[PDB]
């Protein structure tokens, strides 16, 4: 099991998925096409803003 953590914009989370296109999914963090696992996200306005 590998756990990868990071922070991104709100709607930008839509780019965190297999075979997506966009700034993140193309130059920061790209998931494989055969990815099996889970993507967990939660708001962090009380912490990082």
């Amino acid at each position: 099991v590998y756990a990868d953590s990071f922070v991104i914009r709100g709607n930008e989370v839509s780019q965190i998925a297999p075979g997506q296109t966009g700034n993140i999914a193309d130059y920061n963090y790209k998931l494989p096409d055969d990815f099996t696992g889970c993507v967990i996200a939660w708001n962090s306005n009380k912490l990082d803003s």
């Binding site: 075979g19 997506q20 296109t21 096409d33």
Partner: protein
């Protein structure tokens, strides 16, 4: 491939490939039937000879 992203392009190419493979299978089945018919014809021709 150029106008669709990998996720949907995968199912589109799968549709095309299923169609083409089924068409080729139909062609080869009809060819087998015609080959059996021509085998019978050739057997009759050899008997006549």
């Amino acid at each position: 491939l150029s106008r669709l992203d990998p996720p949907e392009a995968e199912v589109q190419i799968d549709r095309l490939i299923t169609g083409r493979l089924q068409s080729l299978q139909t062609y080869v089945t009809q060819q087998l039937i015609r080959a059996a018919e021509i085998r019978a014809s050739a057997n009759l021709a050899a008997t006549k000879m």
